[PDB]
Structure 1
Amino acid sequence: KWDYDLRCGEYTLNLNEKTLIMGILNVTPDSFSDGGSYNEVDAAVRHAKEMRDEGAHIIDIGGKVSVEEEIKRVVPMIQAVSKEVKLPISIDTYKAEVAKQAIEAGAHIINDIWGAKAEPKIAEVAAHYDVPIILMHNRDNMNYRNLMADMIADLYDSIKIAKDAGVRDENIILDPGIGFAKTPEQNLEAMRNLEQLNVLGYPVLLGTSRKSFIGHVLDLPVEERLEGTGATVCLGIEKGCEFVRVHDVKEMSRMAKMMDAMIGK
């Protein structure tokens, strides 16, 4: 079905073989440093190793805050993790400068929650290093004429920005942006119609992990959202998504893997 692989420097991600698990690296900062202190950098590295041993295929790392301050926090983490853990790293930022530094520091994928719309220059950054960029759907309002049609329209605007800066088709990944700019009921409606995103011709990443719309449905707090997260991941894989972005790697890998076998992926 996909006639190429995802090229991330030293690592290759095949898109046909299995659903790919992006593990959400947790980044508890030391209150006393802005730096890359020993307690935080080590907490991260250990967490990255845990997710790798659990079945993660990508480690996702994220840093109101300034550019220089986000870079200070995130660069030492990318460095330590890239050296100590053999999986591609995505940098979860919407800032062209953060993205540059992270890639230089060892990051392999750009993960942009504003889909190149907050800082269009990020698409230039991706275009130059030749890395995959994830363009997530987002906007500053909840006023939809037709949720799905608008989401596709908005994502198409991100693609135009990425392509106009030289981003190759093969390094575009899309994300419906569950939990952003959507009421709970709109979140459920995007889940239900997720397969429509496939007409755009790009691999899709789904991130639903522990989000409040699950809490809204099940009336359960964040630490109780594992079953409802797995429901989303499953329906996500059934509707053709290539990656999921999850906190509970062990559990979701097992679900993904069972889904794949059933759907014939």
Structure 2
Amino acid sequence: TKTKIMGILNVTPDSLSNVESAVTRVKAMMDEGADIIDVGGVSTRPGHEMITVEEELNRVLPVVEAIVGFDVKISVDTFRSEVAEACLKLGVDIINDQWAGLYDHRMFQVVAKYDAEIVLMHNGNGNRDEPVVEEMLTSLLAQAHQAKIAGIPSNKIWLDPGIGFAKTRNEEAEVMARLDELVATEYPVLLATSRKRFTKKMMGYDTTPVERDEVTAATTAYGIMKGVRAVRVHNVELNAKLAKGIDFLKENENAR
């Protein structure tokens, strides 16, 4: 089918980016073509301090509670089962786990409990004994099997290469050049490179985040041609409109 467009909603201020004002943005995102709304309030980067579970729920639930009643799939960016279960009780559809269940292994039992979808992102401290691609596939496939043991079917298990996590710009380029190997897993692949430092290397010069939406859409079109099924972007309108063109051209070539 179509490539799902996952919009970013950051609860907190962020360098790359109120309840009533958040709902206004959520309504704007779907009009720009957002298929999924990823609500996040955490960051697994080393340049941050981990916040308590109670603080995280005070961040996501006021916005989630308002938006669960819309005609859109809702994704929650969290790696702690207590936060995901609380959102799953409200009726969210996707749990975006940045640690792929490594931080909290109860995430698989909770997501499978509510018959929901889970995103498994490749992450780490940056150390590995094998090449980044082989290490990424080894780590993700092991976590993907753990979700299937819990009862989650393969269609509902998403794989994210984790661009910007435990990788250098050279290791990120090695992953982006071999995206077909990650799609060969037959799991739906989610690509998230919106306004990231990888994007900065594509232009070759120092830029602000908002001027990296064009090269972000380039990764979107390139990813769809490789076989990815969803993209996590900031600029929904540019990527959702561009993805529809690539999906149109890919379906047109397959039909003819």
TM-score by length of 2: 0.88
How many Å separate the matches in 1 of 2:22 and 2:129? 39
How many Å separate the matches in 2 of 1:55 and 1:223? 18
1:192-236 CA-to-partner distances (Å, cap 9, x unmatched) read 111111221211111111111112332222122111111111111
Equivalent position SS for 1:264: helix
After TM superposition, the structure 1 = structure 2 runs for residues 114-129 of structure 1, keeping only pairs within 5 Å, are 114-129=99-114
Match of 2:57 among 35, 49, 71: 71
How many Å separate the matches in 2 of 1:243 and 1:144? 30
1:23-79 CA-to-partner distances (Å, cap 9, x unmatched) read 1123247xxxxxxxxxx1112101100001111111110122101110111111111
Match of 1:110 among 95, 109, 120: 95
Kept in 1, the 8 Å contact 2:11–2:59? The answer is no
Counterpart check, 1:168 vs 2:146: no
Tell me the percent identity.
44
Counterpart check, 1:257 vs 2:221: no
Farther-moved stretch of structure 1 (204-213 vs 146-155) = 146-155
How many Å separate the matches in 2 of 1:252 and 1:144? 36
Match of 1:243 among 212, 230, 247: 230
Unaligned segments of structure 1, at least 5 residues: 1-15, 30-39
Match of 2:4 among 16, 20, 43: 20
Shift of 1:86: 1.4
Kept in 2, the 8 Å contact 1:110–1:131? The answer is yes
Report the equivalent of 1:53.
31
Q: Note the aligned Cα RMSD (angstroms).
A: 1.5
How many Å separate the matches in 2 of 1:236 and 1:199? 13
Unaligned segments of structure 2, at least 5 residues: 42-49
Report the equivalent of 1:37.
none
Shift of 1:184: 1.1
After TM superposition, the structure 1 = structure 2 runs for residues 84-95 of structure 1, keeping only pairs within 5 Å, are 85-95=70-80
Counterpart check, 1:211 vs 2:196: yes
1:110-137 CA-to-partner distances (Å, cap 9, x unmatched) read 1111111110101110010110111111
Match of 1:96 among 44, 58, 81: 81
Match of 2:66 among 66, 80, 84: 80
How many Å separate the matches in 1 of 2:175 and 2:127? 13
How many Å separate the matches in 1 of 2:134 and 2:99? 18
How many Å separate the matches in 1 of 2:12 and 2:158? 28
Match of 2:218 among 215, 231, 256: 231
How many Å separate the matches in 1 of 2:11 and 2:117? 23
Residues 157/140 of structure 1: CA separation in 2 closer, same or farther (3 Å cut): farther
Kept in 1, the 8 Å contact 2:7–2:38? The answer is yes
TM-score by length of 1: 0.85
How many Å separate the matches in 2 of 1:140 and 1:244? 24
Give 4+ residue runs of structure 1 displaced > 6 Å after superposition: none
How many Å separate the matches in 2 of 1:109 and 1:235? 24
How many Å separate the matches in 2 of 1:20 and 1:108? 14
How many residues align? The count is 238
Match of 1:150 among 128, 135, 141: 135
